[PDB]
XYZ file of N, CA and C in Angstrom:
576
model
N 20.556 132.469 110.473
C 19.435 131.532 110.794
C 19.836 130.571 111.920
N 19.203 129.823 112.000
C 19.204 128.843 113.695
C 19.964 127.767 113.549
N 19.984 127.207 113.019
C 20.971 126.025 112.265
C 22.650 126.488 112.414
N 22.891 127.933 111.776
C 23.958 128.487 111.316
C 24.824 128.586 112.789
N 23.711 129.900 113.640
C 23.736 129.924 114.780
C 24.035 129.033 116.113
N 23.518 127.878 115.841
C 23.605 127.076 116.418
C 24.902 126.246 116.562
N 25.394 125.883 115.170
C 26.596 125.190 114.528
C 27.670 126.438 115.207
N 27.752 127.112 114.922
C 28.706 128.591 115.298
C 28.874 128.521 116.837
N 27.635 128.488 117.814
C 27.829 128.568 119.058
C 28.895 127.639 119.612
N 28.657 126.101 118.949
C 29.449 124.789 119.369
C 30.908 124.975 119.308
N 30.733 125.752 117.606
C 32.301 125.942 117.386
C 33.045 127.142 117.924
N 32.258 127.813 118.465
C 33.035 128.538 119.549
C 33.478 128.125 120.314
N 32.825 127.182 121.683
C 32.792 126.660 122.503
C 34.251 125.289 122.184
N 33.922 125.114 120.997
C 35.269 124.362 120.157
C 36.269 124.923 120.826
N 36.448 125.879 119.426
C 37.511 126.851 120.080
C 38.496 127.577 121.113
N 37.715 127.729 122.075
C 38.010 128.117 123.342
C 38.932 126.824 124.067
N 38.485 125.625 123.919
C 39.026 124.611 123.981
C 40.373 124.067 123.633
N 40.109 124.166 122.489
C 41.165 124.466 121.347
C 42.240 125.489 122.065
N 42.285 126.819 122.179
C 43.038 127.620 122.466
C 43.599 127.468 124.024
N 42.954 126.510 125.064
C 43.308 126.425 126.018
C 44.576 124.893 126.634
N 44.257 124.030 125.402
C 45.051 123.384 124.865
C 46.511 124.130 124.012
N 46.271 124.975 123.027
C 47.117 125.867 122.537
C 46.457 126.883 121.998
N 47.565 127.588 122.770
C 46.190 129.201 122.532
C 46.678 129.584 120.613
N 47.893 129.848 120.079
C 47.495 129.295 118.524
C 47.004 128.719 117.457
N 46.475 127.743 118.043
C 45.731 126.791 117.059
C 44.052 126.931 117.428
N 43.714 127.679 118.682
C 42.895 127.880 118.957
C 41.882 129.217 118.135
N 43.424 130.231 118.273
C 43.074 131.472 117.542
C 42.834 131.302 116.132
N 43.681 130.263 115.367
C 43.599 129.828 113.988
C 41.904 129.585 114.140
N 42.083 128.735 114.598
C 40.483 127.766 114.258
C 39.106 128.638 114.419
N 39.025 129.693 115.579
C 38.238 130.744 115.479
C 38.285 131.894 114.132
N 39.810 132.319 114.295
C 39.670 133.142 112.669
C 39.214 132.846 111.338
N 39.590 131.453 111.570
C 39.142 130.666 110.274
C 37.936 130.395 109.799
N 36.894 130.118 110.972
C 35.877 129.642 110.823
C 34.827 130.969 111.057
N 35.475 132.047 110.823
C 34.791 133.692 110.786
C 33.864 133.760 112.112
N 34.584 133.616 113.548
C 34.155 133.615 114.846
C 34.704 134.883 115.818
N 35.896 134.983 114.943
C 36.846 136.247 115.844
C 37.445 136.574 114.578
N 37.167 138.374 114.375
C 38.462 138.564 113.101
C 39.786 138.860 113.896
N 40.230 138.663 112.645
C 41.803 138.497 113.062
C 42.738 140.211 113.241
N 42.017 140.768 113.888
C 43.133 141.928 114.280
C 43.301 141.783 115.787
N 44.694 143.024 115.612
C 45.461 142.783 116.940
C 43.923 143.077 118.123
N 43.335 144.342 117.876
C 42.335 144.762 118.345
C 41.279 143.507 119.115
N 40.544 143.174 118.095
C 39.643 142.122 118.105
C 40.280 141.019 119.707
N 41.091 140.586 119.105
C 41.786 139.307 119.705
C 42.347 139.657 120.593
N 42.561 140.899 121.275
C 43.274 141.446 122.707
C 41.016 141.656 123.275
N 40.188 141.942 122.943
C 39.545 141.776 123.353
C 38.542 140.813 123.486
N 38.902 139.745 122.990
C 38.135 137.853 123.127
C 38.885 137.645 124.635
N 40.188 137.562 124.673
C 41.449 137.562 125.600
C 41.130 138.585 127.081
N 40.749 139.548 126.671
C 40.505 139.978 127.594
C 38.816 139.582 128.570
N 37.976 139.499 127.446
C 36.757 138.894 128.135
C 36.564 137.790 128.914
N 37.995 136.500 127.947
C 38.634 135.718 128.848
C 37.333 134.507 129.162
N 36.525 134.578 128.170
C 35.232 133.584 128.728
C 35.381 132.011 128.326
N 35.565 131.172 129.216
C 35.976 130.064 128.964
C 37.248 129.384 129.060
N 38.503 130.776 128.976
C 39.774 130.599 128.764
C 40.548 130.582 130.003
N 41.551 129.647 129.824
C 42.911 129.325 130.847
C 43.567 130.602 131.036
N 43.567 131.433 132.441
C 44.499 132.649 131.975
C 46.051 132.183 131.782
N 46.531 130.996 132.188
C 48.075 130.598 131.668
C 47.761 130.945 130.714
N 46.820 130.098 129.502
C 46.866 130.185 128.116
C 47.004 131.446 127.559
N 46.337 132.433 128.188
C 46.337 133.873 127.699
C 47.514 134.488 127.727
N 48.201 134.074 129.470
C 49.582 134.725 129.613
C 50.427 134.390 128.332
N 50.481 132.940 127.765
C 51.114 132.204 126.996
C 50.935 132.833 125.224
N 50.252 133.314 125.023
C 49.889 133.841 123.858
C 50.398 135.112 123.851
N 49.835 135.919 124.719
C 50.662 137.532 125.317
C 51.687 137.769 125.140
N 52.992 136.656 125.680
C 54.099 136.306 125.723
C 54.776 135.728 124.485
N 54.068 135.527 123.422
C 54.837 135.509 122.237
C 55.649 136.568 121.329
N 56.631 135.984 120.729
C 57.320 137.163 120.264
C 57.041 137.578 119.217
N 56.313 136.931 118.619
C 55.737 137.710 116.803
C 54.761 138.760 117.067
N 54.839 139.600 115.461
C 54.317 140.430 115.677
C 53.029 140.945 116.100
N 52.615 140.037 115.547
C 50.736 140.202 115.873
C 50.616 139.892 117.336
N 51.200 138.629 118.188
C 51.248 138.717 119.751
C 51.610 140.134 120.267
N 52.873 140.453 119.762
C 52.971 141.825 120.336
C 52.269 143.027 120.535
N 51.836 142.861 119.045
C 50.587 144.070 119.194
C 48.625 143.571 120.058
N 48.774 142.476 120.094
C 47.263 141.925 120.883
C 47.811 141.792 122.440
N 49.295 142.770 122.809
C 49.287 142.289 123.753
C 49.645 144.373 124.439
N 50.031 144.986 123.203
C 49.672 146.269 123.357
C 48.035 146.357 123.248
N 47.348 145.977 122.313
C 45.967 146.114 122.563
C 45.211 145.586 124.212
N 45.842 144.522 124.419
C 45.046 143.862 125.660
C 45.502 145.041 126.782
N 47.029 145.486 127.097
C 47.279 146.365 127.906
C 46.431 147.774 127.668
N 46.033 148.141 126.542
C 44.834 149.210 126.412
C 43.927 149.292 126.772
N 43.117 148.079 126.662
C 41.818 147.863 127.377
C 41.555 147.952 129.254
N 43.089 147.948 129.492
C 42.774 148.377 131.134
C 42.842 149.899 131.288
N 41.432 150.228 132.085
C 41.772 151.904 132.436
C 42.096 152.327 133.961
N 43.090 152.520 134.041
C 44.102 152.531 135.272
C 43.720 154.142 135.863
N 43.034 154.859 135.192
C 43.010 156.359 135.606
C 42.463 156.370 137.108
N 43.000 157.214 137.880
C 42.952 157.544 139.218
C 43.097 156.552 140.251
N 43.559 155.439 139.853
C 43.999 154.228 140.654
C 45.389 154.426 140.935
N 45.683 153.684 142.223
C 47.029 153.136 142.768
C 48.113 152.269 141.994
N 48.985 152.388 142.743
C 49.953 151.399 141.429
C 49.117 150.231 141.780
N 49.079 149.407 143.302
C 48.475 148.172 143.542
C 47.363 148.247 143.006
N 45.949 149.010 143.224
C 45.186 149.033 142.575
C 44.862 148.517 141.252
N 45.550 149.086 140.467
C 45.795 148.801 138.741
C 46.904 147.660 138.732
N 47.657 147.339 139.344
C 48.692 145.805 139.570
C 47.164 144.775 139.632
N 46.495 145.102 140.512
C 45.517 143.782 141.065
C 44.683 143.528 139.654
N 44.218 144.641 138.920
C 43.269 144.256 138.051
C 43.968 143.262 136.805
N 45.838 144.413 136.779
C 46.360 143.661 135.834
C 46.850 142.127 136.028
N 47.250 141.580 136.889
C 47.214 140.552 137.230
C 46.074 139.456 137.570
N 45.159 140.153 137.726
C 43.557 138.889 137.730
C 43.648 138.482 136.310
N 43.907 139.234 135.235
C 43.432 138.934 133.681
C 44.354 138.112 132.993
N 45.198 137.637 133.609
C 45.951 136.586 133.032
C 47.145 136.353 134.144
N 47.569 135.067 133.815
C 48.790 134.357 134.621
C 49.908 134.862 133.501
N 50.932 135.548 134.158
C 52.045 135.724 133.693
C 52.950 134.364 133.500
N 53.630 134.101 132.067
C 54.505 132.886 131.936
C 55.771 132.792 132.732
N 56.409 131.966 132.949
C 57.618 131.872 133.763
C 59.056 133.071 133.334
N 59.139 133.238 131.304
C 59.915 133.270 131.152
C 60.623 134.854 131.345
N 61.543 134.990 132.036
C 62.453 136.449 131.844
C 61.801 137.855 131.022
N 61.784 136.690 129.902
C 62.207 138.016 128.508
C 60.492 138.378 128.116
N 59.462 137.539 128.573
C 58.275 138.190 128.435
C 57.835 138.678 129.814
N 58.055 138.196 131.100
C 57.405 138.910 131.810
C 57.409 140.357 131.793
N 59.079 140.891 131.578
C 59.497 142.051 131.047
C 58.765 142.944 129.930
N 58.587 142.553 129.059
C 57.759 142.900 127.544
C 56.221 143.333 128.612
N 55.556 142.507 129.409
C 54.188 142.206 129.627
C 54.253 143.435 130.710
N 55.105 143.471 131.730
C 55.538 144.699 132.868
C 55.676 145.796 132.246
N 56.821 145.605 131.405
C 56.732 147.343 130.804
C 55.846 147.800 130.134
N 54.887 147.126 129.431
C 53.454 147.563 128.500
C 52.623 148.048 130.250
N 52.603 147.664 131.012
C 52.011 147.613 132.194
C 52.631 149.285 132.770
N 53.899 149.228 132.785
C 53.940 150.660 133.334
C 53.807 151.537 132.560
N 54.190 151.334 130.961
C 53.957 152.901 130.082
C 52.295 153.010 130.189
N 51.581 152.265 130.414
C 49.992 152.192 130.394
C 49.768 152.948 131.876
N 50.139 152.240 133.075
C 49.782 153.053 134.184
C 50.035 154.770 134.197
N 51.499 155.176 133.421
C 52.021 156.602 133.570
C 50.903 157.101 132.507
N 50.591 156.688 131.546
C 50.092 157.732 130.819
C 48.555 157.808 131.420
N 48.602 156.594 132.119
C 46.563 156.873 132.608
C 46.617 158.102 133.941
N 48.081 157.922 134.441
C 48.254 158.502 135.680
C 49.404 159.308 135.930
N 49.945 160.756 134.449
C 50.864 161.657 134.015
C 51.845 161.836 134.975
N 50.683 162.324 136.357
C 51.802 163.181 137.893
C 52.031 162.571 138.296
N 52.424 160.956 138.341
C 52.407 160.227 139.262
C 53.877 159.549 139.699
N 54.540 159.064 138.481
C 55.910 159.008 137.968
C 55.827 159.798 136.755
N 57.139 160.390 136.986
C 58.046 161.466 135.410
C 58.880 160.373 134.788
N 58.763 159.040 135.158
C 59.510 158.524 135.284
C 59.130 156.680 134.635
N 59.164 156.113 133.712
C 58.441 155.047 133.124
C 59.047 153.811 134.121
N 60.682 153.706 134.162
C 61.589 152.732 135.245
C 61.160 153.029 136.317
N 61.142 154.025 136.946
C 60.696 154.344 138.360
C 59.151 153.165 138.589
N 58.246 153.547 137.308
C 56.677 152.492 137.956
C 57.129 151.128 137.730
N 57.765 150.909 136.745
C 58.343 149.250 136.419
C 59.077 148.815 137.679
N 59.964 149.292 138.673
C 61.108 148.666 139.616
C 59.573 148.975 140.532
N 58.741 149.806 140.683
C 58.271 149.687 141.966
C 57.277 148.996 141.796
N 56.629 148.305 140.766
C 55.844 147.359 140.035
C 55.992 146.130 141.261
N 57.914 146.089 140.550
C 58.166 144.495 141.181
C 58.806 144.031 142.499
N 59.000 146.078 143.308
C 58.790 145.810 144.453
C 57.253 145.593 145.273
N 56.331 145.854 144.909
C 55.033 145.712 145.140
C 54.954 144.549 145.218
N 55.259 143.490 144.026
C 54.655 142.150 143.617
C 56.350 141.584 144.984
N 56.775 141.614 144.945
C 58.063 141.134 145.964
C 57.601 141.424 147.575
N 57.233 142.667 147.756
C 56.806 142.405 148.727
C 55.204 142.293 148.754
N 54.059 141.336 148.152
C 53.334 140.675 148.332
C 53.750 139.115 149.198
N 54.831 138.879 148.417
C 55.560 137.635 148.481
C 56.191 137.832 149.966
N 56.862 138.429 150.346
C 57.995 138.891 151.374
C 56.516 138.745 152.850
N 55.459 139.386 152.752
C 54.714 139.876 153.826
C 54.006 138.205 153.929
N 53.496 137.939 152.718
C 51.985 136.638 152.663
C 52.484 135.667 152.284
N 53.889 135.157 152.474
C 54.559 133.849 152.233
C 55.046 133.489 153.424
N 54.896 132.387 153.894
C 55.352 132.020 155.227
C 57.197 131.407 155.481
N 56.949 130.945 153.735
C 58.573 130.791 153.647
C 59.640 131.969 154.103
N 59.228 132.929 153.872
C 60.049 134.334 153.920
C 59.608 134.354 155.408
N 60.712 134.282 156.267
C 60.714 133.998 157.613
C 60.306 135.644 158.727
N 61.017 136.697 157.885
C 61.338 138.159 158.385
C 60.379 138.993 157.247
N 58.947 140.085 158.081
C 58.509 140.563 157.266
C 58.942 141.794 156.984
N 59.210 142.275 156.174
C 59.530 143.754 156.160
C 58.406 144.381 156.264
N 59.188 145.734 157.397
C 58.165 146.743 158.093
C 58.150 147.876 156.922
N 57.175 148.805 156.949
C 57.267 150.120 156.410
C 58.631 150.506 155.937
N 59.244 150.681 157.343
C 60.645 151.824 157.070
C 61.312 150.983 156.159
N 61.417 149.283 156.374
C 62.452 149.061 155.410
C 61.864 148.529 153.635
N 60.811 148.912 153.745
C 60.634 149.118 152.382
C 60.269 150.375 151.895
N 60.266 151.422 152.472
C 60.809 152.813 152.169
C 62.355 152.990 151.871
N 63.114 152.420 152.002
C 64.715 152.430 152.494
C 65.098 151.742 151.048
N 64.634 150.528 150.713
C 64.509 149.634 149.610
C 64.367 150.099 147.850
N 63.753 151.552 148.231
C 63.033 152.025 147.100
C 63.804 153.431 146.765
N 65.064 154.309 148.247
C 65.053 155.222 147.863
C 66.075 155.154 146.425
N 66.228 156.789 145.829
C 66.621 156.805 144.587
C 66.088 156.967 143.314
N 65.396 155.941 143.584
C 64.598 155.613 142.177
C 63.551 156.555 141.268
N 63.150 157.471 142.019
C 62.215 159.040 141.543
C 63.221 159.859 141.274
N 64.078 159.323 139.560
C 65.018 160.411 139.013
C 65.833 160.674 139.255
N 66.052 159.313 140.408
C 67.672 159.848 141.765
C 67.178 160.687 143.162
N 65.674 161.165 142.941
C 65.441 161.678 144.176
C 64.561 160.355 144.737
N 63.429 160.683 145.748
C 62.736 159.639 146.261
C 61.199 159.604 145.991
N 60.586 158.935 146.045
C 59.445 158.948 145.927
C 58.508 159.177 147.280
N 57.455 160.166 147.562
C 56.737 161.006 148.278
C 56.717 159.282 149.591
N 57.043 159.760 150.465
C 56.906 158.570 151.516
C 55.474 158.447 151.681
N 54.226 158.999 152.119
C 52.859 158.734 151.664
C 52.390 157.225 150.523
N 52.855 157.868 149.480
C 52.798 156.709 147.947
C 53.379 155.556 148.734
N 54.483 155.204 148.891
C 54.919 154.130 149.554
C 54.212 154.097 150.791
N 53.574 154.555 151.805
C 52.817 153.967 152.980
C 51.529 153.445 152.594
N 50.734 154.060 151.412
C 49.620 154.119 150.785
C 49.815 151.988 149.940
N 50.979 152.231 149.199
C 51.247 150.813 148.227
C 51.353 149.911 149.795
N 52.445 149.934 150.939
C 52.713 149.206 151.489
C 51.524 148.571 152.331
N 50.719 149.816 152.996
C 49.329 149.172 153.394
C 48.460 148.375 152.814
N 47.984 148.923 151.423
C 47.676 148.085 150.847
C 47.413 146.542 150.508
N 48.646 146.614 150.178
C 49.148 144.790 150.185
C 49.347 144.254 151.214
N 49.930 145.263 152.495
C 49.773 144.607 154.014
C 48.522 143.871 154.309
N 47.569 144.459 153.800
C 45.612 144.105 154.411
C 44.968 143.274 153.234
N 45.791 143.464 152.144
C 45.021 142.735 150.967
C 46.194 141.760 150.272
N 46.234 140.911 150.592
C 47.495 140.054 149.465
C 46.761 140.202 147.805
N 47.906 139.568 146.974
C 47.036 139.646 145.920
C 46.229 138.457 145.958
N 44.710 138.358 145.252
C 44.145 137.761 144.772
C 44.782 136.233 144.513
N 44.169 134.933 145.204
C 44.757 134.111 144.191
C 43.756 133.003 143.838
């Protein structure tokens, strides 16, 4: 009824608040008040719709180490469909949907859910799960390297072909793929 409805809308709008302040106490206060159920599922897709919400806050929740973060953060990496996209391609979408946290040990956790997700959307692409993770964060490095003015010397093509060999199993990866990623980000920085 309208009353119910009404009261519910606010306390959503609560909520969101709530969670952007701390994205835990935020999630409490929605589960609680029967607004979002509480599976990993559910709550990787509030997070992902992202309406209202801080993407720090999201990164920040993602990045927890308990279990239920872990798994809403395998669920949230599900909800992207990476099929027939580029590594940058599928990098850009994954990175609009939340700010990655500062720390080491989750950006890692958040990257590698990121490459076993890209290989399996995209089988022929890497044989190889480390191979998409290192060239992940040469991609995101040289975003930085080309569209930062601090970084004085841009690297050309050849030397980020040179940068990368090895890494395809000990052989190299198709020089194309790398002219294809390097253009890319040459003409498009990421998003900010």
């Amino acid at each position: 009824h309208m009353s119910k409805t009404l009261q519910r809308n606010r306390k959503m709008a609560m909520g969101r608040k709530k969670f952007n302040m701390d994205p835990k106490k935020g999630i409490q206060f929605l589960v609680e008040n029967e607004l979002l159920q509480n599976t990993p599922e559910e709550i990787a897709r509030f997070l992902y719709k992202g309406e209202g919400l801080n993407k720090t806050a999201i990164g920040d929740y993602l990045g927890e180490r308990e279990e239920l973060n872990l798994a809403v953060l395998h669920a949230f990496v599900d909800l992207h469909e990476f099929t027939d996209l580029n590594l940058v391609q599928a990098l850009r979408q994954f990175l609009w949907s939340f700010r990655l946290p500062g720390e080491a040990q989750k950006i890692d956790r958040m990257m590698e859910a990121f490459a076993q997700r890209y290989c399996l959307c995209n089988p022929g692409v890497f044989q190889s799960t480390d191979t998409c993770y290192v060239l992940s964060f040469a991609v995101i490095m040289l975003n930085t390297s080309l569209h930062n003015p601090n970084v004085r010397d841009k690297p050309g093509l050849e030397r980020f072909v040179a940068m990368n060999r090895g890494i395809n199993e000990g052989g190299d990866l198709p020089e194309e793929l790398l002219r294809n990623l390097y253009d890319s980000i040459r003409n498009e920085p990421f998003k900010i």
